[PDB]
Amino acid sequence: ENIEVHMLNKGAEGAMVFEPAYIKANPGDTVTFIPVDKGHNVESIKDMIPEGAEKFKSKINENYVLTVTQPGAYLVKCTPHYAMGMIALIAVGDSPANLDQIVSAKKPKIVQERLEKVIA
Numbered sequence: 651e652n653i654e655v656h657m658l659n660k661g662a663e664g665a666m667v668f669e670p671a672y673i674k675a676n677p678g679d680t681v682t683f684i685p686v687d688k689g690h691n692v693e694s695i696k697d698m699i700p701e702g703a704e705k706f707k708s709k710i711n712e713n714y715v716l717t718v719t720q721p722g723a724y725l726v727k728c729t730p731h732y733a734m735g736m737i738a739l740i741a742v743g744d745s746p747a748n749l750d751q752i753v754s755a756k757k758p759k760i761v762q763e764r765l766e767k768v769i770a
């Protein structure tokens with residue numbers, strides 16, 4: 651199946667958000683990122699994607715289709731706006747083995763805060 655995500659300047663959660671910021675998927679599903687507003691992209695955060703998943707980085711203002719294979723959690727950011735908290739969590743399969751590790755990982759306070767709301 652395909653899950654559609656919008657990249658926006660402002661959304662329910664504040665400025666610079668992925669909608670939805672919590673994406674539940676299964677191996678083989680696609681995640682389509684659509685920059686509704688300009689100045690956004692999607693990029694995998696180093697060490698915040700499952701063991702064996704490939705790193706990715708879309709072009710700014712480009713529609714981007716990600717195919718998810720490896721089960722586990724993925725924390726993706728917007729390159730330009732990561733520091734303002736523009737992130738999304740992709741959970742592939744049940745009880746992602748690396749979820750606790752991602753929650754614990756070093757990241758900007760703003761990011762960490764949103765991560766906490768998205769998980770809740």
Ligand SMILES: [Cu+2]
Nearest residue numbers: 690728731736
């Ligand atoms: Cu952005």
